[PDB]
């Protein structure tokens, strides 16, 4: 067995975009094991220690003007540049969700019908799933499994709705997503 | 509303190194440290953009030198093993005899070293399985995805066996047709 202690070091450069490239924040961070020790926040303008472990580094790096000026302009040469490079296939990537409605396999309490609205294979993750009973939105009884990121640039989610079904009622699952101009709807006819 | 992360790491004594780009949590690419080439997460990205993989190795060398300096500075304080949270799901609702994919989600763990194996009816699978590299997390722990394409049936049962230093015993997450 391998019992040797491990020593880990991570370096991350995060480009945060607001309203496209209008507002950009660059966050450079160093993490020893699970402890972030020093970082460079473009909103601050210089390296700052996050813990005592990183004090020597912030001080040393802030003494190098060439490093400091590159970091201060990186918001443009690094962040905005990379955004322009990947925008067409990342920011603008769109894959329509597959939507289907069927009753849950469980169905606990008798005179009740737990409905399931399955929404999968979509991108981006931003999505709106709502339930309606005869054209009026259902706030109560609605429960979601959450937004699941599949790791292959795809998302999925399950949004349930408990109902006291009455013949003739129409329960609609409506999905709004950037991939479509108008909402997608699937109806359960009770 | 959008975040692009260049994430790298070096780990001793495993001598493991990684360099990757992330977009809103999804990997754009990572560099193969041995072949010294860019590995795009999705085939098409390679036709829409490029990256000089060779140069990433310059960063990994600096990362290693920095790790050793920090290791000594901390008086050789080792990392605390944090066991993974493991979940198994299908990429889409399962339908009998309808092609699907089993996803083994390994999350919130560190250090970035894990052994994952798929088991179909108690026996190890290998056909068509794929996996991603370690993905970054805001808390600085890692995420990872392992995949297994399969054909649903009421007979075939599966298990995702995960080993990690933070786990006293191998963790097996079971899966089988129920719907």
């Amino acid at each position: 067995g391998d019992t040797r202690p491990r020593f880990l070091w991570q370096l991350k450069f995060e480009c945060h975009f607001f309203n496209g490239t209008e507002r950009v924040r660059l966050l450079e961070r160093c993490i020893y094991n699970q402890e972030e020790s020093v970082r460079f926040d473009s909103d601050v303008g210089e390296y700052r220690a996050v813990t005592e472990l990183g004090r020597p580094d912030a001080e040393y790096w802030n003494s190098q003007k060439d490093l400091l000026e590159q970091r201060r302009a990186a918001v443009d040469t690094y962040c905005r540049h990379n955004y322009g490079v990947g925008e067409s296939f990342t920011v603008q990537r769109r894959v329509e969700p597959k939507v289907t409605v069927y009753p849950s396999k469980t169905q606990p309490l008798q005179h009740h019908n737990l409905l399931v609205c399955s929404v999968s294979g979509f991108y981006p993750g931003s999505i709106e799933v709502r339930w309606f009973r005869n054209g009026q939105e259902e706030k109560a009884g609605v429960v979601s499994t959450g937004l699941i990121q599949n790791g292959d640039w795809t998302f999925q989610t399950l949004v349930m709705l408990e109902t006291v079904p009455r013949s003739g009622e129409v329960y609609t699952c409506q999905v709004e997503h950037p991939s479509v101009t108008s909402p997608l709807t699937v109806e359960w006819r009770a | 509303e959008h975040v692009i992360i260049q994430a790298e790491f070096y780990l001793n004594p495993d001598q493991s190194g990684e360099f990757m780009f992330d977009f809103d949590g999804d990997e754009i690419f990572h560099v193969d440290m041995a072949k010294k080439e860019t590995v795009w997460r999705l085939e098409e990205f390679g036709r829409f953009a490029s990256f000089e993989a060779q140069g990433a190795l310059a960063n990994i060398a600096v990362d290693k030198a920095n790790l050793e300096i920090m290791t000594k500075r901390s008086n050789y304080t080792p990392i605390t093993n944090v066991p993974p949270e493991v979940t198994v799901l299908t990429n889409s609702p399962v339908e009998l005899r309808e092609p699907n994919v089993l996803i083994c989600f390994i999350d919130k763990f560190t250090p970035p070293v894990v052994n994952v194996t798929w088991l179909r009816n108690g026996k190890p699978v290998t056909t068509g399985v794929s996996e991603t590299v370690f993905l970054p997390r805001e808390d600085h722990l890692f995420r990872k995805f392992h995949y297994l394409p399969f054909l649903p049936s009421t007979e075939d049962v599966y298990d995702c066996r995960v080993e990690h230093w933070g786990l006293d015993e191998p963790l097996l997450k079971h899966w089988e047709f129920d719907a």
Binding site: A74, H81, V85 | F21, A58, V62
Partner: peptide, 9 residues
């Protein structure tokens, strides 16, 4: 894409 160079400690 372009990378940010790693700063040496």
């Amino acid at each position: 894409f372009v990378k940010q160079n790693a700063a040496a400690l």
